[PDB]
Structure formats: C-alpha cells, structure tokens
C-alpha cells in the first residue's frame, strides 16, 4: 500500500509497459563501444544515436539509466527484436531476479541493494541485462552504480574485458553485482556485531524493535539472493551457444560466490535468531533475579513479622512475662532464625 | 593499491625457513636461516620440501616465489592472511591456501593461521605465519622413513600435507566436542548469565570453523575430480579419500551447530525451572504464614466482650491451632507435589 507492493499491472495485457517503480526523475544513455584495439564512450540522451551499435560485431555496452521513459525502452526492444514479456519484466521492479535463454538474446534480471546507516532500510534497484551476441543492453532506474570498477576496466586496458567479447562483459557486470553483495554483507555484518554487543551488554526495550527490523531486512535480502543461486546455475548448466565456452569457468566462479553469499545470509539469519533467544534468556534471568531478591526479603522478614504479631497479643496469664527485666526475650529468636535462613539461602545459591 | 604485495596478518615474530630433500633411498635435512642455499633444490630430480615458516619478511617470500616461478599475484595471495581456502591450477605449479586452527582452551579462543602450498612436480613449498605447525606425522614419516612417502613423488607429499591438516581438523573437532560437553554439564546444573556469552562464543567459533571448512570441500573436489596434470593419476584416490574425510568433518560441524542451537533452549528451560524453585519457596512460606496470621492477628483486636482471657491455656491453645493449621498447609502442599 506504500508502492512497495505489487498492485502494478492488475488485469492489463502482458504487452503493457506500466512502469512499476517510482524513481522517475532522471534519464540518460551511457555507451561504451570497446573493441580489441578500439574504445568509444559517450553520455548521450537521444535514443536514435545508439542504434547503429546493434549490428556492429564489436562488443558494445549500452547502459540506459532511467526506464520510466517508456518510449525509449519500447523503441529499444522493438529495434532489438526483444519479446514484449521481456519488456514487461524490464519495467516491473517488483520482479524476482531471473534468467531467460532465448534464440537471439539472453535476458537476466538482478537487484542492486544499497543500505543506509542508523535507520535500517535496505533499498532495492532493479537492473536488467540483455545480451545480443554483439551488444549488452543494461537497464537501470537511477544513477548510482556498482559498475565503476568495470567502467575503469574498459576505460583503461586492464584485465581481460578489453579483449574478450560481450559474454565476458556480462560476466563482469554480474561479478560487479556479486561484489556489491559482498560489501553489503560486510555492512550488515557490522550491524549484526553492534546488535550482538547491545544484546549481550545493555538489553533494552528498543532492542526488540532493532532485532525484528533487522530480521525483516535479512529475510527480504534472502528473498532476493536465493533466486541468484538458480540464476547462476542456469547460466552455467545447459549453456546456450550464445555464451562462449571459454567464459564458462568465470560463471562457475560467480556461481560459487553466489553460494557463498547464500551461506552468509543463512548464517546471519541463524545469528539473528540466536540474538533474539539470548534476549529472551536475559529477560528470564532478570525475572529470576528479581524474584530471588523478593522471596529472600519475603522469607527472612515475613516470618519475623509473624512472630512479632503472635508474641504481641491482647491476652493475659501468658507465659511471656517480663521475667527477663528487659523485653527482648524474642528478638534473639528473630536474629537466630534470620541468620539460619540467610545461611540456608546462601548455600542454596540464592543471592 | 592495485595488485600490491604486502603482508596483511598480525603474527610478526620470526622465521625459520627449513627444507627436507627426501628421495627413494636417501634423504637430507638442511634447515637454515638464509634465503639462499635452498633455491638449488628447484631443479633436483628428487622431490624436495621447503618450509617458509614465517612470511613476515617479504624479502624471502618474494625471492623464493619469483625464483621458483611463482607469479607475483600468487605471492600476494600467500601474503594475504584473510583469504579462504583456495585452489588454483597453473601450467607448472598448483597453488593451495589452507587454514589451520589453534584453540586457547583456558580462555576459549579459536585462532587461525594460513598455510600456503605450492606444488611444482619437483618441490613442495609451504609458507606459514607462525613458528611451529601441525606436521609432525608427515615429518616423522619422512625422517624415520616410516611411511611409503619416499617413492611416490611430490604428489604424495602434497597429499600428506593435506592429510595432516585434515587430522588437525579432526583433533580440533574433538576439542570442540570436549568444550561442548563441558558447557553442557556446566549448564542445567549451574545456570548463569555468563553461560549465555559462553554459548554465543562457541557458536561464533563454530560459524568461523564452518566458514573455513566449506571451501575445503570444494578445494578437495577440485583436487581429485579435475585431476590437474601436476598431480599424477595414481594419487587421485588418495585425494578422494581426503574429500570423504572433509565431508565427514562438515557433517560433524553441522551437527555441532545444531546442538549448540538447542543448548540455549535447554538453558532457558533450566532457568525456568530454577525460578520455579524460588517460586515454590515463596508460595509455601506465604501459604503457611499468611493464612496463619489471622488467629495471631484476629487476636490483637483491642476489643472487649470475648473469651479473650477466659480459656484453659488460651495462648497455648492458639499455639496448638497454629501448629494444626501449619501442618495442615504443609500436608496440603506435600501430598500433591507443590515443591
């Protein structure tokens, strides 16, 4: 009900292009037509000027930042022969990460995750890759990308991306996503550590708020990462001829990295559950200590109140005369029984 | 820095740099404290075994790596002490990164030291960070000629090193099992707030131990399935057996993690019983003294027109009804297990 739900298309036909997302303020088209010895880059805005790179045998990376403009994305899909369902999944942010092996192009959907300190909100950004054996169309919804290492790798002839074809380009983009996932797991690990210190050192009422919000963020993170295992397994198993066999070990590497992030998320879920259980145990220990002190006050003093009440009576001809001059013939009993009871409690591990 | 070569650990004490040149019938030990006088072992037909124990000195590491043909980034991976277990096959050497664990039992810490293996079909280098290491079985096998290691090439030497690490992991699992048993007997008998942090530390150590073990399954599956040409064909079943030990170790650590997870719940139940004990104490005290304070407080009513004084031992009789109702409540509590 806060636009994070999927009341997006309802009964509209699959060919519709209603932009589910909300970031509809900025738009541009990065182009990098690198080759074995050539490298062309620009920051265009006009849709037409990027088309002549479709038929070029030299690999090209076209990064369309901002897909709220339905016209540009539909024109790109029409000129590239992209299936209308793929366009629908392009403009639908609330779509699971996925892979589609078509006759002409490979379609891949990832989610870039970013995190903010203090308040625990994990904001998502749909990112899409379409590999067309000579061009890698990348769709993103606002500037702020984790591809900067990749952009430098093309810009300066370092690594292998400057030499290989578009398949390695897509592999490098996937690896950039996975590295972003590493850094976000590191940040959430720092959050786990601070929450663990808070729980173990200073339990508080707001700690439940913190741990439940963190568990919600973690379960959403798992909801998104778990499809990545299947996505990379599909990118490795039953390879189409559209991806070269020489880059398959790179997809093995990123698949292993995805396995690592899945294991780390499962471990972090386990640690969060353990932290909640530790807080419950601390609550139980506080209850036990408070009841211990209450009972010990209620066992070495309440009998004393009784004995004071019973010895002082509105009776006569009682064998409790002032034969001891002073009154305290009973205070000694109070002290003795109090000492005996407190020693009994001390040897019973209470207090 | 881009592709630099620096040491990112913390154990910086000293180095030894020893070597064992073992063969079919003769062997030699030439441990020194100099980078030179050991490089000539590269081209020797008899397999050799170099131990750069202590890689704080980047000079020796770089000289040995670049002289033996090790690529500089392999040297960086050696010097990086934060990497998970890794395997990388090159055209003339195989690189492996393993982690060996030590356990401070007195204060319950689990420290990790990385060991780097390089097989070159003519020598087996290891780079370590701390003096002393878990290689006594293989070292005694080579020195005393006890095993069959002599006549099986450097591949069996690398297997022997892997087996030494796996046996050390089994020993670490035994120590962790002992610690778990000590905690389990400590809990349910001595409940305490400290036991929660003890359990949490054990769980974190198990998390780290699993995070190190799980890459080893992949590394060993790589080692036998992919059958690199550096490793002879006849040695593959040995690495298969080591992988079986690795999957056994992974199962063991998974079961230990599950047991530690249930340990907190059993502690919570123990604490609930512990507070139930003092609750029964409070209830019995109240229910034998609160209902027993009227006839010690209802007598005390500053009023006349009662037999407050005309009685046959009135105060002894009220003490008698004290005892009667006291034992009545005691029976009421004992006969149906209110304690």
């Amino acid at each position, epitope marked *: 009900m806060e636009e994070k739900r999927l009341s997006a298309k309802k009964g509209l036909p699959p060919g519709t292009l209603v932009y589910t997302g909300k970031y509809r303020e900025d738009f541009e088209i990065e182009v990098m037509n690198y080759s074995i*010895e050539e490298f062309r880059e620009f920051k265009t805005t006009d849709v037409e000027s990027v088309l002549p790179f479709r038929d070029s045998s030299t690999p090209t990376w076209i990064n369309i930042t901002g897909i709220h403009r339905t016209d540009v994305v539909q024109r790109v899909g029409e000129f590239f022969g992209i299936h209308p369902l793929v366009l629908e999944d392009i403009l639908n942010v609330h779509q699971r990460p996925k892979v589609e092996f078509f006759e002409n192009y490979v379609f891949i959907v990832l989610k870039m995750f970013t995190y903010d300190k203090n308040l625990h909100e994990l904001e998502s950004e749909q990112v899409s890759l379409i590999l067309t054996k000579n061009c890698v169309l990348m769709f993103q919804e606002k500037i702020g990308d984790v591809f900067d290492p990749v952009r430098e790798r093309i810009r300066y*002839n*370092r*690594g*292998i991306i400057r*030499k290989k074809r578009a398949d390695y380009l897509l592999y490098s983009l996937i*690896d950039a996503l996975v590295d972003d996932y590493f850094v976000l797991l590191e940040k959430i690990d720092d959050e786990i550590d601070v929450l663990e210190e808070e729980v173990l050192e200073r339990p508080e009422k707001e700690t439940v708020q913190r741990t439940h919000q963190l568990k919600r963020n973690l379960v959403e993170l798992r909801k998104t990462i778990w499809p990545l295992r299947e996505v990379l397994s599909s990118l490795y198993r039953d390879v189409p001829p559209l991806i070269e066999k020489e880059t398959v*070990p*790179y997809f*093995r*590497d*990123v698949y292993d990295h995805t396995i690592q992030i899945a294991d780390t998320v499962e471990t972090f879920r386990d640690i969060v559950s353990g932290l909640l259980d530790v807080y419950l145990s601390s609550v139980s220990n506080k209850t036990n200590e408070v009841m211990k002190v209450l009972t010990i006050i209620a066992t070495i003093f309440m009998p004393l109140t009784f004995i004071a009440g019973i010895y002082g009576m509105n009776f006569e001809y009682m064998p409790e005369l002032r034969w001891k001059w002073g009154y305290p013939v009973v205070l000694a009993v109070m002290g003795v029984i109090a000492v005996i009871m407190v020693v009994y409690f001390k040897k019973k591990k209470w207090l | *820095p*881009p*592709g*630099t*070569l*620096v040491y990112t650990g913390k154990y910086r004490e000293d180095f030894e740099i020893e070597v064992m040149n073992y063969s079919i019938e003769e062997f030699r030990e030439f441990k020194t404290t100099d980078v030179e006088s050991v*490089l*000539p072992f*590269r*081209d020797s037909s008899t397999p050799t075994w170099i131990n750069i124990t202590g890689i704080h000195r*980047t*000079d020796v590491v*770089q*000289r040995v790596g*670049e*002289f033996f*043909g090790i*690529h*500089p*980034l*392999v040297l960086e991976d050696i010097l990086n002490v934060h990497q998970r277990p890794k*395997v*990388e*096959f*090159f*055209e*003339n050497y195989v690189f492996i990164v393993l982690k060996m664990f030590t356990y401070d039992k007195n204060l319950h810490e689990l420290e990790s030291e990385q060991v780097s293996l390089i097989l070159t079909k003519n020598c087996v280098l290891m780079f370590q960070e701390k003096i002393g290491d878990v290689f006594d079985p293989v070292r005694e096998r080579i020195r005393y000629n006890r095993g069959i290691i002599r006549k099986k090439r450097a591949d069996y030497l690398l297997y022997s090193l892997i087996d030494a690490l796996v046996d050390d992991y089994f020993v670490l699992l035994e120590k962790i099992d002992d610690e778990i048993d000590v905690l389990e007997e400590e809990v349910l008998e001595r409940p305490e707030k400290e036991t929660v942090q003890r359990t949490h530390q054990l769980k974190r150590n198990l998390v780290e131990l699993r995070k190190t073990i799980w890459p080893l399954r992949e590394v060993l599956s*790589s080692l036998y399935r*992919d059958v690199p040409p550096l490793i002879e064909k006849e040695t593959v079943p040995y690495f298969r057996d080591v992988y079986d030990h690795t999957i056994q170790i992974a199962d063991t650590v998974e079961t230990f993690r599950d047991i530690v997870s249930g340990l907190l719940d059993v502690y919570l139940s123990s604490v609930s019983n512990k507070t139930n004990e003092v609750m029964k104490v409070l209830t019995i005290i109240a229910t034998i003294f609160m209902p027993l304070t009227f006839i010690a407080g209802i007598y005390g009513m500053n009023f006349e027109y009662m037999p407050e004084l005309r009685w046959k031992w009135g105060y002894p009789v009220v003490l008698a009804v004290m005892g009667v109702i006291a034992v009545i409540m005691v029976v009421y509590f004992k006969k149906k297990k209110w304690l």
Partner: antibody
Amino acid sequence: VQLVESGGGLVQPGGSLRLSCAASGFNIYYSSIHWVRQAPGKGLEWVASIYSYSGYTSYADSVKGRFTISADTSKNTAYLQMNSLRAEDTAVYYCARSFYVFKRGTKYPYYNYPAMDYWGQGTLVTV
Amino acid sequence: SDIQMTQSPSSLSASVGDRVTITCRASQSVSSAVAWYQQKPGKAPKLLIYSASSLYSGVPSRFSGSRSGTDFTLTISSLQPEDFATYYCQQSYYKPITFGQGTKVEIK
C-alpha cells in the same frame, strides 16, 4: 608514460656512478622498474630490478651483491648507484617499467608474467 | 642456476613482403612468459609481443606469436623496409630473466 635517463659518460675502472631514470605518467611506489644493459655490438642482458612498494631489489647473478639500486617516490625517479666498477660494465643502460595484465577468480586464473612496455631513452657508460 | 634461453637464427635475410619466422627455446619450460622485443640501432627497443600470444597496443597486426610448449615462434607476415631491426626473445617466468642472443635482419 615517459622514462628519461641521465648520467652518461666515462669513468675510471673501480669508480662510482649514479644513474637516474625519471618517470612521468605513473606512480613508482606501487610499481616495478628494471635496468638492463646492452654491451656495444653485443646482446642485451638484465641487470637489476626494483619493486619499490616493499623496497625490494634484485641483482643479476653476474653482478650480484656489487650494485646498488632503489627508488624515490617523492620525485618518482628510480636511482641506481653503480659501484665496484668492472671493465665489462661499459654498455648502454635502459630503464624500463614492467607491467602485467591479470584476472583473478577463475578456477584456472589467467595471469601474465611481467614484460616491459615503456623503455628509457638510454645512457652510455664507458670504463 | 641460470636459464639458457636461445634464439635463432643469429641473423637472417628476408625481402619485403615475406613471412619470416624467429624461433626461441628455453632449457626449462617457462610457460607463456616469453616476450618478443624489437630494437632498431638508434632507437630504445620496443615491446612487440608479450606472453607470446597477446599483441601490444600500437603494434600493427602484422606481427604474431605462437606456442609449442618449450618452443616459441614469432612470425611476421609481410616485412616492410622500415621495420628492419634486431628482435630479442625475453623470458620472465624465472626472476633472473634472460634475453635471446639476437636476430638482426636487414633489407635484402
């Protein structure tokens, strides 16, 4: 991307010399340098290597322990202190900047061992 | 512990528009760490080929290199009179580093 040398001329045998190759366009600190020699009308042979990040120096076995070499990050210049001069040291010296392209992560990682893109102009030293 | 790293021919005669081949071999396998350098008498060498397969940027696509295990081959498809110099065969798998004895080709 420019390596420029200085300090050529004639020296008495057994004397001393300083050979400076200034580098422009890159940082020496996290980089490597090499000095090689070309005897007059002969082949080309390696002499010395600097890995300036760790202050690492390597000398050719034919000149082992007799030369000195280091770097200076402040001026970004590689320096070679030539000592214990021999009659065969007269040559043309060349300062080169090593390099290598790499990609890490693959099961069979594709690394390249160093080579020499950029070369100094040269310096003639005679004994 | 030196590595003998030989390069042949010592000298050769080739005309313009010829496919010349320079062979090189090390005593021990050096993987693919061999590089081919070109030095004119008045110039300050230059890196033609690194790792025996990759072609350096700026070099014309004419030059090529191959791999035969221990053997390394540098092939020039069609020589130009301007590109006549001495070609060296460096190895870098082992730190000491050695260069080829030399291969000078002049105009035929």
